[PDB]
Symmetry: C7
Subunit: 222 residues, 7 copies
């Protein structure tokens, strides 16, 4: 009543699948030999490890005047007596953050998939090297998950900033609402810079982790 | 009060039941030999592993202009406030993202077929769990691990249907805020970001399809001997 | 510190109680020999395992035009309910009602079959607990369907309220459509989970029947 | 650092205290020999185990027309039928809480002095107290759940008045009533089944519940 | 330096007196205060009562304190505009019967926290130096403190719950005024009062039963609570 | 590279060592004097010898002077305000005293080694209780803001519904709750000081030298 | 399936990578030998351990009168403390200032938190880079390394949350001030503003102590376990 072999029946698909496992290995090795070290230097050029404290995580280049509450005393924000514009400077920086996050997820996802495809058949005993594989997969997914949540967090920034702006329009002299907008912008600005450092450091620990344990990641058994 | 057989009494049902267990095994084997490999190539053809970094998870092909706030019902009164049927009424038009709609429809298709295929492979293994015994059940642990990984992918795809309703609800809510507060520019940026978020989530969903289909296939292929006969 | 035996004092009650334990066992065996297998085949006929992928969990047979935004007062804002989904939801509740009755009595019978607590040689009693737990999970799972149905109508009503207030904000109308499409899928997934739960319970009891009845 | 016995000082209270321990034991035994079997047959007569599937948990006896939404004012009445059925539930739950609490307390009063080893029978006692407390807490939550029904039904009814043509709000009232109707009957079955498993559990492990050592 | 006895000798004595005074109060509670309260609460909810004679609602006034479809005597049952804000003159009385019963509940809870609190503290102060092994009696001490703390914390939450009753009753009563056509809002007030009435009585039983299981627990394991080693 | 991490600046090394000396000084001073003084102090406010119900009562609570008045305002409970200020003082001094005793024990955990570190568990047990009481006192500042915010909300409802009496009963019950909560806090102060002191005193030998 | 070495192909990249690992070690050692002890004494100078009880966590230096409701910029100067109709919507000209004293103190907190995040991240990364190749057995010292990394991340996340709490302060103060404008008859709303400011003043000072204590607890942890943190094998 049964056959118990599950090789793909279509021989053309069987080759395309095997070509796929080859192509991943290329991308995985390629990321480790070229892409990732270059990205380490890239983010380091943005947040140099040798910087003195407070020279990275500061708020001095943050424009606190161009994008605050304004009064007016084929169109735009001119038919209204008071508007509250968005922080274009933070917008431009957030756009860069998403690019760093996308390219990270692509790179990490294929390296993680490659290690998963290298996990051997489950057996009893002598699978200490498999734990190393699992630790690497775990750390890769953790970094990947962290970058994935950035896209949703950015929508929350605009939604939260907009809510406060409505309150500023209703209570334009209650100053704590305006300080809240400023503080929201300053917080997002700091979070952006901490994200960039996390990029730099994550690429480094992931590269260092895989490099040290490369022999067990590839051949986890004898 | 001491009978110890519970085979179905109806011989027609006994036949229909046994045929059902056969059909499961049949469909499960077919999914592994053809349906899954075909989809591995399919999704890879959509998000190729050989793509250059940033060429998959980008937003360059997302129309960010055709479906933003503009300045059909109630054709006589455009962009106005009405009092109709004793209630307040906004004849302000804010369109949906026709581009995202078409992509979201395809996602549900990928999710539907995944639940059907993965669920049956999971069901087949579950129905293949042996009688509970003490000891010598290491192979049962392999069965449980496979069922867990199969169930995780299945549940992840199942959550997509509910999440899509939230996209339209969330997009609709913010658009109301743009209509009430055209001065708060962040409400317009929030709509813009929401579409960008959904566009990225769509593409990451497709990659997860590709990768889940392969690791599940690769996992089952490697442990196939213990998944079928966990004790002999 | 007086007398320490507790058989029911009224002898007529003792008979009705013993009769009750007989009536459960009959119903429990009957559920395993006929009621559950008959229902497994029924739900499979609704979501057949032999269907091509996507032909089960789809939305092709869902009417998406008859019940969208278009008598009691001299009104203009009328928004009907999805009569097609209503009929399917009514069928779901019967499936859930019949499940709780069938599974609950099988569970009670197994509970009544747990022996006196003793130390050791109770591996089969652990099997009994697994069966009772799995039966209770399926019972609890089906039980929550009634509340989920109330939420569907409530959620559809709120969105429909939003469509009346913002008749040109198109995403509110998409949200109604997607809500109905979601329920249509959930209805079918509910039927699959019914089918799969009944058989996994049946397969579980069948394989371990000896330890379920005589764990010692 | 003075005196190390804590027997009650008042001899009249000491007598009343022991009488209470006697009265508990009496009530508990009476509950197991008469009160619980009597209710098992009682609840079974309301939800007979021999009923065909769906004949218990149905909605056929639920009035779905008398209590729906009605110059012209418009009111929304309560489901007087569900009111009537919910009142009985609170009666069933109250009598259960009274009965189980004293049986649970009696076993608690029968838990021995803590010793090392040979306290396997105490585990039987603990298991029994756990199940009694579980059933008691389950019945206790019914009073708060009933207030939510009226609160929830009132909320939806407000929406029907505000949006009298959005029919899903009217379906929500109907569905809520059908949900409460089903929950009522599931509660009655849970009563029957709880009384039986509690009685069956105590009967089987009676020797260790009374003499754990 | 490695000794930390108090430098002030008057303080050092007062501290020893306090440990003595606690031991005094705890024993008094076990010998007199607790048994008296066991009988007291039992006289309120006698164990010999037939089922339903305790947890019923027959003695609850459900008619005197419902909304009748005093300040601002000129405009009765009306909506006003004062200081540019909305004003409702509508009168809705409080449930005076439940108020009197709740006041007693707070008294029972206050006396419980004081009595149970000192017994718990006394046992805690009797925990020996932490050592490895031969600490089976310390587990008994820990078990007693846990049950003592559970009863104490349970009673402590009653003060907060009583505020919620008045807040919830007022909220629903507000809805009855806004929606006199929604009959379920009127049913909700009734059920809330019936719920509080039942909860009050179950609280009284829990007082009775907690006093007994606590007294029985300490008496049976008294030897290990004082000399766990 | 190089494998020493003594502070490079010789001036900092002295300033740092003086700090660790000052910590030990303050912690011992707290255990020998500050804490026992607090035990007697709080006991004199909630005497253990009090008859039941004489502590946790509401008899001394002014419940009429600060109710809804008559154009209509709603005043604050000045009596509770004065008692809340004292509560904050007790909590501040507690955090300061307990924090240094906790910090000193944390600074006294030895170098990590494998096995024969039963005494380190005692240190951890002591730190856990010290932090628990400190965290409990820390939340008092936030809880006080909630009192006024909650009281103001109810008073807002009383102004909107001046004849719905349950809203007025809610104000009264809130004040009575805060009055009781204040006193339970003082007892918890008294009891925590003793349980911490008694715990440290009994296990003092292992708290200081957990390994010999 | 070919070669299983993944050294960077460009020798130039290997130099910047190796230079980077050296530059971290420099920064980490510099932080442990100089930066952190300096910070310990600094925060101690703000909340001195030798202070008598209640002299630190008090409210005596808090201006609670200058900024309550009767460097900002008053708007709608023609209509003061009134309701207006602007862009067909509701508007309250009412002026309610911020607490400049709390503002200045919060600005200092953010610098303390930023410099902490910068310092801790490099020490943590350095230890992460110093965790050896995974091997079976003799990895008791790696547990020390992991424990050290764990505590470093806890402190780093703790400081990170200060920025959001500061946004919450202003939002909370603004809402209550809104209530004071609507209900000047409810005296408890005015007390809530006062208590909110008093709460933040205390939280500011407790934050500074938590800084001080975390810097020393991290330094004390690394100093005592230095041999196993660097060479666990």
């Amino acid at each position: 009543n049964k056959i118990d072999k599950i090789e793909p029946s279509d021989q053309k698909i069987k080759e395309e699948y095997n070509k796929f496992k080859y192509d991943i290995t290329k991308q995985a090795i390629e990321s480790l030999r070229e892409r990732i070290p270059k990205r380490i230097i890239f983010f380091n050029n943005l947040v140099n490890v040798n910087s003195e404290p407070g020279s990275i995580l500061n708020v001095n280049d943050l424009d606190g005047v161009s994008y605050k509450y304004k009064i007016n005393k084929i169109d735009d924000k001119v038919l209204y007596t008071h508007y509250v514009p968005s922080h274009k400077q933070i917008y431009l920086e957030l756009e860069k953050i998403k690019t760093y996050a996308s390219e990270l997820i692509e790179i990490i996802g294929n390296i993680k998939l490659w290690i998963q495809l290298n996990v051997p058949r489950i057996e009893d005993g002598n699978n200490f090297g498999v734990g190393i594989q699992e630790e690497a997969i775990q750390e890769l997914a953790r970094v990947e998950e962290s970058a994935f949540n950035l896209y949703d967090a950015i929508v929350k920034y605009y939604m939260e900033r907009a809510k406060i702006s409505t309150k500023v329009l209703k209570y334009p002299n209650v100053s704590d609402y305006q300080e809240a907008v400023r503080e929201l912008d300053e917080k997002e600005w700091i979070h952006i810079k901490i994200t960039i450092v996390d990029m730099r450091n994550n690429y480094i620990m992931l590269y260092d982790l895989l490099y040290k344990n490369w022999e067990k990641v590839v051949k986890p058994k004898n």
